[PDB]
């Protein structure tokens, strides 16, 4: 017993600085106009703006009919930005969020908005909480239905660079994929007994999954429906993971409950723990990298971690 028992090695540098936002509401999403100017959104109609790359954030309160909205998603492409939330709401800007307008949503939308993606120049795509997919090309005046066959309330949803999506079923029994041209989601059975929690895309054309009990896997490069070995980054089942994101093609971060944050420098094969952030009293729900030297992790109760290059 000459090395610490049951642990994984501790990372040599902690790049994450903890920030307390001027709120205790949960933050759900973030998007940048450029390197310095960006927006974040969350629960209770929370909206904040940064002009310094996300070091400091200023609350903005829109005078809406009520403040119970859960702002689920924000997306900018240059100065054009969009926010969606539940109960159904859509906000739009063309000036970097200096003025926002509410876009009326068709009451026949199946489910409430879950995700919006700005495509620039008046175009955007929206997905509802039950997987209906719509696109606008005219700044939200008209929406074309791409998928109307609903799939139940998705547990998680992620997008690839080419506009594919992957959605985990409500209770993690299976997952579904969609790409442009398809008229419905395609279901795929899970490949572990443990239920799926989250799935997304790697920067090399594969899928990743997080499953119950702190395990992860990656799809086969030759066949995205074949899956590799089930990995245990923390060598245990007690700590669940919530999100996985790549800073670079080889450097991967894995965020989970109760201060858990791990990094792999070999593409996800082996992991080391960022022990400094174990002191932060928060689950780490979402990792957002905007470039290799700008990134954020969403905690609870207004906690943010901000990436600071060594």
């Amino acid at each position: 017993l000459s090395t610490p028992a049951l642990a994984i090695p501790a990372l040599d540098y902690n790049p994450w600085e903890a920030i307390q936002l001027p709120t205790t509401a949960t933050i759900l999403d973030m998007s940048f106009i450029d390197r310095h100017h960006g927006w974040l959104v969350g629960v209770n109609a929370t909206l904040m703006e940064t002009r310094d790359g996300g070091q400091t954030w200023e609350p903005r309160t829109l005078v809406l009919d009520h403040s119970d909205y859960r702002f689920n998603s924000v997306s900018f492409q240059g100065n054009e930005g969009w926010i969606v939330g539940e109960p159904p709401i859509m906000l739009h800007t063309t000036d970097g969020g200096q003025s926002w307008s509410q876009i009326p949503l068709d009451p026949k939308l199946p489910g409430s908005p879950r995700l919006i993606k700005a495509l620039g120049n008046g175009s955007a795509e929206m997905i509802t909480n039950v997987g209906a997919i719509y696109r606008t090309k005219d700044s939200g005046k008209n929406w074309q239905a791409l998928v109307q066959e609903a799939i139940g309330v998705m547990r998680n949803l992620n997008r690839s660079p080419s506009g594919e999506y992957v959605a985990v079923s409500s209770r993690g029994s299976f997952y579904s994929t969609w790409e442009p041209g398809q008229t419905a989601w395609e279901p795929h059975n899970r490949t572990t007994s443990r239920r799926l929690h989250n799935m997304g895309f790697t920067p090399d054309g594969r899928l990743w999954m997080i499953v119950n009990g702190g395990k992860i896997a990656f799809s086969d490069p030759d066949n995205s429906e074949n899956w590799g070995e089930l990995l245990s980054p923390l060598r245990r089942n007690s700590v669940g993971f919530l999100d996985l994101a790549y800073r670079t093609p080889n450097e991967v971060w894995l965020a989970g409950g109760a201060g858990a944050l791990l990094c792999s420098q070999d593409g996800g094969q082996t992991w080391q723990q960022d022990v400094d952030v174990k002191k932060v009293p928060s689950n780490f729900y979402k990792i957002l990298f905007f470039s290799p030297d700008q990134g954020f992790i969403l905690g609870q109760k207004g906690i943010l971690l901000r990436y600071v290059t060594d």
Binding site: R60, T61, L62, V63, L64, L91, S99, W100, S101, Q102
Partner: peptide, 6 residues
């Protein structure tokens, strides 16, 4: 018409 800030 655009929204007000509080």
């Amino acid at each position: 018409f655009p929204l007000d800030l509080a």
